[PDB]
Design a binder for these strands. Structure first.
Lengths: 140, 82, 88, 129, 99, 151
RNA sequence: GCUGCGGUUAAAAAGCUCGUAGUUGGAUCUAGGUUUACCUUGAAUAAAUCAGAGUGCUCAAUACAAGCGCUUGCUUGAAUAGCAUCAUGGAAUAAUGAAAUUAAUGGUUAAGAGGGACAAACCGGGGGCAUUCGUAUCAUUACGCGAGAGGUGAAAUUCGUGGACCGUAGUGAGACGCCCAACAGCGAAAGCAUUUGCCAAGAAUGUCUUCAUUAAUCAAGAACGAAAGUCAGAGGUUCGAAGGCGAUUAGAUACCGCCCUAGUUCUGACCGUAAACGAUGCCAUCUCGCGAUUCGGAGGGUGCCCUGCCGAGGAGCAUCCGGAAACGAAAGUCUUUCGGUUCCGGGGGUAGUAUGGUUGCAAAG
């Protein structure tokens, strides 16, 4: 059992601090390499350029090819894969295109049946992908 | 039973209880005047004597140590002292 | 201060002849250069003169012992056997 | 190694009460145990008790009225101020209508009601209800 | 899941128990764990005791006996049916079965 | 006995009587018992043996009750205190005996274990006595000198 | 997770013990009819913010305004609370100090705490060193036999007329101590079993013996620690990794059989790991019944029996409560949480991997 003496505050506090490092959340938030490992460097949004487009086999039991685009961030030049929401929106993405990208929702974890894809496109060519899908605007 | 008089225990139980677990501790040993046929000197002796108690001038062994109470030599009687 | 961490007396050989050979020689060198308690005068003054010969500095007795130890295990066992047979 | 005679005594009382016994024997006695039992008596949670003397720590024998839900000790003896007495009572006692929290103040050993009335803090000893 | 309170052995107050070699397979099994049986049998089978008696060279000769203490490991004992699997409740029964 | 290094939960000890008064049939005097204790000490016994003898032969149930003072306190008051307390002396003697046996039998690993335990007890008791000023502040148990010290 | 988690099986009790720092420590001094720690109350404590009165800026956030008479006017609100230091009072609780010409001259008790002493036709596969004996295995000698023996599911490899295998009597080597042998015992654990001798150690029990808190758990630190494995020297019976054959099979680098090398044995050093398991840390205490078992004691009867006999073990089946349940007299006395203390866990993998450090001859820890 834990110590209970009236003069064991040092032991309690030191043990708690030592065991906080065995917590996934605390370690994830205090490791120190978070900025270097995270493509966005702690931000919520980033900008990049398109390189190619790929179709990813959705995981079982789902059968489909999700249409993502490989992008290069401007802040650091890292390569990532970003998902293009809504139907027939990959058409609005052409190679060598400027895109705004954001997180997918699960804070660096893949979402749904798309394997290894954790970002999503929020704007292409300074246009909102939702607007492009909804016809409110056209390709510049 | 739920209702047991712990304050005034049954004397038979107290006698047949361990010396340390009685309501008040009391040793099971005693001192005895040993009378040995012959020099007829009463000699005080401890019940669980561990040494060999000897006559003063009578120079004879009165008790023999054992694992429990001392074993009085044959021909010797004893009387408890108050 | 402890001058050598592990080599000890065998440090005279420097970096020669191999670590295992030097380690094997260390035990016997220490044994042959140590002083032993003399069974006659009882003082720690038995020193090796030559291989097999041990001199007591105090009582001046010369004993035939081991090459690098004052006495050997086999000799001790033989002595014990003789003593036991004498007793029984 | 025994280190809290009060804790042992309250554990024995609790076990006896749960088993429904009419008397319970408490091993080594002490002034603290006596005052704790006296407060419980004044508040009616136990019957009369008798302090058996044996030229050592001694013993106690308490008569149980079958009215005690729980008697527990708080260790270590934390310092309670008048300002957090309310928080400690709300944390430890089943309700505000009954149950008592035993303190040891300079004035002596009392319950939290008396401590509040006299405007005293002190070190926590235990509680019963 | 723990199948048995004694963990399949008879080891209490003990750290290590020397093993025995099973009579059939030869496998090493702890002596407490190995199933033992003491078999005392007539040196001659019941079908030939009469023949040996009628062929005896003495007026009254007592036929000797064979005494064997057999140790079986669990696998070979079960295979030879010295013991059988039991229901969950019947497992706790410890009295020897009727002979 | 109790349990310090062994798992022994023994419940065997002396049960002192409740009566703190000398028995009526006890006719030894408070000073006569002191002179008897002192004669035994001169002879060379230690407090435990003196108490055993008095209880066994002379009927003295409790020297503290009869003489009004403990045996060691009596011997100290009259200046017969030993250099080493009885228990510490006995422990050191036991350690010396174990070392002597080990010098001959060097595969007695059980003896090595017992020696470690005994020396730990020796150090703890020596610390206690130094704390209570009953030993010189610089006293220290030396394996080399222990034999002569305890003999 | 201090309040407030969990560690038998879901992640998690170190293999075990000693031990410094740390943490925690039995009862006991005016009941009645000098230091500290701690609690109470005050002192010193910039605003802004938070809590908090009043006021229709139209409300409210806000803001701190405003509100009546009549002109030369009166009253205004713009509050109230929020470690260390000092002082006052309290003297429970927890530490701490006093003494080794008269007077009671001055030491608490002796823990169902601990240590030590003493006892024993004591108890024990507890340890160590010598020593005695036992059949069996193998090899071999002598004699007889006569063609099989061995081995398997069946065979084969193999051994055998140079006379094997089988008999009877020896001899030699090394290993191992059957049956007795157990819900038996001892040891901190790992572990421990032929006789006898010697050495040191120990449990429980008995005690109106002695000291008097000397204690519990323990970072760092240290001893021991199965089997395999490494180094050196002796031994090499049996078995036997690797290796080689004969089988089986679709294959068989295996299971089966035959011949075997390291090893298995001893001595002196290394390694420090096991499902090192009760998958349950240690100390103290409370809660049930029954009859058996090992040791010691007490009282009787004749080594054995009896005493609802007393302690200490090791268990079993009647079991409150507990638990997800399996089940647990502890894994119970826990939302009624709180006796002390050490270690450990935080979804599954990556992974006990990479790297760094350290120990090791290496394997590896």
């Amino acid at each position: 059992g834990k110590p209970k003496g009236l003069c064991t505050a040092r032991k309690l506090k030191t043990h708690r601090q030592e065991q906080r490092w065995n917590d996934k959340r605390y370690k994830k938030a205090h490791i120190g390499t978070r900025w270097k490992s995270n493509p966005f460097g702690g931000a919520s949004h980033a900008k990049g350029i398109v390189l190619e487009k790929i179709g990813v086999e959705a995981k079982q039991p789902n059968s489909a090819i999700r249409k993502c685009v490989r992008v290069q961030l401007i802040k650091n030049g890292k390569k990532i894969t970003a998902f293009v929401p809504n139907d027939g929106c990959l058409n609005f993405v052409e190679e060598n295109d400027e895109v705004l990208v954001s997180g997918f929702g699960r804070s660096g974890h893949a979402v749904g049946d798309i394997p290894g894809v954790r970002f999503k496109i929020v704007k292409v060519a300074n246009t909102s992908l939702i607007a492009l899908f909804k016809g409110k605007k056209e390709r510049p | 039973p739920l209702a047991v008089d712990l304050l005034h225990p049954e004397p038979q139980r107290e006698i047949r209880c361990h010396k340390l677990k009685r309501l008040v501790q009391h040793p099971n040993s005693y001192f005895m005047d040993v009378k040995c046929s012959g020099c007829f000197k009463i000699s005080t002796v401890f019940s669980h004597a561990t040494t060999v108690v000897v006559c003063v001038g009578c120079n004879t062994v009165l008790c023999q140590p054992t694992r429990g109470k001392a074993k009085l030599t044959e021909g010797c009687s004893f009387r408890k002292k108050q | 201060a402890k001058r050598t961490k592990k080599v000890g007396i065998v440090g005279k050989y420097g970096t020669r002849y191999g670590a295992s050979l030097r380690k094997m020689a260390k035990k016997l060198e220490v044994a042959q250069h140590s002083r032993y308690t003399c069974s006659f005068c009882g003082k720690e003054a038995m020193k090796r003169k030559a291989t097999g010969i041990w001199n007591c500095a105090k009582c001046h007795k010369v004993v035939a012992g081991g090459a690098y130890v004052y006495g050997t295990v086999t000799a001790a066992t033989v002595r014990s056997t003789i003593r036991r047979l004498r007793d029984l | 190694v025994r280190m809290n005679v009060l804790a042992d005594a309250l554990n024995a009382i609790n076990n006896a009460e749960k088993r429904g016994k009419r008397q319970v024997l408490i091993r080594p006695a002490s002034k603290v145990i006596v005052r704790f039992l006296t407060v419980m008596m004044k508040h009616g949670y136990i019957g009369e008790f008798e302090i058996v003397d044996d030229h050592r720590a001694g013993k106690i024998v308490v008569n149980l009225t079958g009215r005690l839900n729980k008697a527990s000790v708080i260790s270590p003896r934390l310092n309670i101020r008048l300002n957090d007495l309310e928080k400690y009572t709300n944390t430890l006692l089943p309700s505000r209508q009954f149950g008592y929290l035993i303190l040891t103040t300079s004035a002596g050993i009392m319950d939290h009601e008396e401590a509040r009335r006299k405007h005293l803090g002190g070190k926590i000893l235990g509680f019963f209800f | 899941t723990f199948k048995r309170r004694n963990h399949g052995r008879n080891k209490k107050n003990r750290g290590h128990v020397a093993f025995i070699r099973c009579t059939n397979c030869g496998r090493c099994c702890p002596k407490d764990k190995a199933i033992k049986k003491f078999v005392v049998r007539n040196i001659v089978e019941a079908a030939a005791v009469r023949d040996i008696g009628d062929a005896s060279a003495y007026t009254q000769y007592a036929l000797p006996k064979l005494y064997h203490k057999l140790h079986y490991c669990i696998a070979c004992a079960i295979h030879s049916k010295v013991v059988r699997n039991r229901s969950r409740e019947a497992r706790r029964d410890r009295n020897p079965p009727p002979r | 006995m109790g349990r310090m290094h062994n798992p022994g939960k023994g419940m065997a000890k002396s049960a002192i009587p409740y009566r703190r008064s000398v028995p009526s049939w006890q006719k030894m005097t408070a000073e006569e018992v002191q002179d008897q204790i002192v004669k035994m000490a001169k002879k060379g016994l230690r407090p435990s043996q003196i108490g055993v003898i008095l209880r066994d032969s002379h009927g003295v149930g409790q020297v503290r009750r009869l003489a009004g003072n403990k045996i060691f306190r009596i011997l100290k008051s009259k200046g017969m205190a030993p250099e080493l307390p009885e228990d510490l002396y006995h422990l050191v003697k036991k350690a010396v005996a174990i070392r002597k046996h080990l010098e001959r039998s060097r595969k007695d690993i059980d003896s090595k274990y017992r020696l470690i335990l005994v020396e730990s007890r020796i150090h703890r008791l020596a610390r206690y006595y130094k704390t209570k000023r009953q030993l010189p502040p610089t006293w220290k148990y030396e394996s080399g000198t222990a034999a002569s010290l305890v003999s």
